[PDB]
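does this look right to u?? NQ9 version
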Amino acid sequence: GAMGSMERASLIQKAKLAEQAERYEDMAAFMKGAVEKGEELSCEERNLLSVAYKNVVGGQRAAWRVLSSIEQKSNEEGSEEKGPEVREYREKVETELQGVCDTVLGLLDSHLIKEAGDAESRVFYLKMKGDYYRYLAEVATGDDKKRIIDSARSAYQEAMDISKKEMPPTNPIRLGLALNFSVFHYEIANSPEEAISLAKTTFDEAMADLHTLSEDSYKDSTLIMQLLRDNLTLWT
Amino acid sequence: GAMGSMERASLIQKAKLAEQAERYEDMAAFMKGAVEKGEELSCEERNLLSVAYKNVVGGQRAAWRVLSSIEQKSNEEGSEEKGPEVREYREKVETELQGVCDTVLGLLDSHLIKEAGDAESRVFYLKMKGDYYRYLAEVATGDDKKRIIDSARSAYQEAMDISKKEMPPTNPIRLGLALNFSVFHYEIANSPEEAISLAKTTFDEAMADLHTLSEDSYKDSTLIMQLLRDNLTLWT
Amino acid sequence: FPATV
Amino acid sequence: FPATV
Ligand SMILES: *CC(=O)NCC1CCN(C(=O)[C@]2(Oc3ccc(Cl)cc3)CC[C@@H](N)CC2)CC1
Ligand SMILES: *CC(=O)NCC1CCN(C(=O)[C@]2(Oc3ccc(Cl)cc3)CC[C@@H](N)CC2)CC1
Ligand SMILES: [Mg+2]
Ligand SMILES: [Mg+2]
Ligand SMILES: [Mg+2]
Ligand SMILES: [Mg+2]
Ligand SMILES: [Mg+2]
Ligand SMILES: [Mg+2]
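got this back:
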């Protein structure tokens, strides 16, 4: 690994600098190096890792969607043939995206998940596993599409089961997991009713537990609750 | 070159797709491949090349400035010592930036400029040469800083001399050249009076020639004239 | 597109 | 920062 010679602490410091500079490819590379040191990640460090890869893959997903749209339009009646270029370039972006997903999934499997015993860490990583399988599912069209979808479902389900047992209904990790699993149901699993049920039940159970919270925890929880409401509004 | 196997036309097509996808690194790589085919570039193609590299280097300059600011703050009285990391990462970004500048300058020298005989093409490339020497100058701190500044000045001056002889005062290339040379004077050459004079004279001579233009050419010219006015406002 | 975090 | 094109 190109980061093998750099101190763990220096990699974390640089990941923070890269975030300030909006250099998310750099940030992800730094965080990958930090994970490969083999020590567990603190909460702050887990969030650096997630921010970096979310921003890299987010950009790739947006580009993929632009290119897929152009490709779809090229295959409509009356569209002039323009050769293989659109498909080729969509494939290029797709392959890069799959590579990033495989990299993240690799870090999780070697060996973040297996060393994560606390609910907060384990749920966080399992949510990530679901998320990156979901990104793979978005672009999957072949023999393995069902298995990819099932891998996302399985990771999310394990995370949900732990979160319900071990975390309060206002915990931001529990909320963001439910938010994203709900989107999985709506966008990937062709289960809009499940998506809506999950988002509603999550919102309502969080609402009932807000009274237990400090001002700052209330801020954190209500932010994600609003995202649940935003999706419900989009879907109903 | 990794693009050596791809058709010129396919590289241009893909550069356009990459622009739509906001994939400017890809766009620049495609355009570099197209230039390396060895044929001259059309107007549209020259603009694809400039857009791509402007966006790549623009991002690097913004990141460099964030990191340089943090580094400067670290060297103030009372600042706690945090080790070499800030300098290292600023250096990393700097080196990548210099590499992009050298790549562009390389394309211009091998062999875009020497084959460009029409005023519109020659001025466009010489403006680019000035611009990328100016980006090098922004980060230069050593033995060659003066020569780098002089290289920018010389390229801009040649472009100005051709533009004044061969193009009307409202030509968008002539205007954008003057805009950028004016910024060179203000930000790089420590010549704010020259910057202001140039921007004013350029604006006023353009104003006097607007009457000759179509609606669409008027739109194009007045846009850049407004940038001249914006800088004048910032500087006075 | 729906919100995720 | 000043405008360039
Ligand atoms: C270690 C730990 O507690 N990590 C989670 C923490 C929760 C607060 N938080 C957020 O609310 C934002 O991002 C999330 C990321 C992941 C998850 Cl599972 C939930 C929320 C931070 C940015 C904000 N604009 C959206 C929510 C940061 C991470
Ligand atoms: C071949 C040719 O004519 N190229 C120049 C052409 C002029 C119009 N134009 C613009 O005005 C914008 O960008 C410029 C780039 C370079 C120069 Cl020298 C001048 C202008 C296009 C985007 C706009 N928001 C700013 C001006 C495109 C290029
Ligand atoms: Mg060590
Ligand atoms: Mg594929
Ligand atoms: Mg249920
Ligand atoms: Mg050919
Ligand atoms: Mg240096
Ligand atoms: Mg003069």
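Chains A and D do not touch (no CB pair under 8 Å). idk if thats expected tbh
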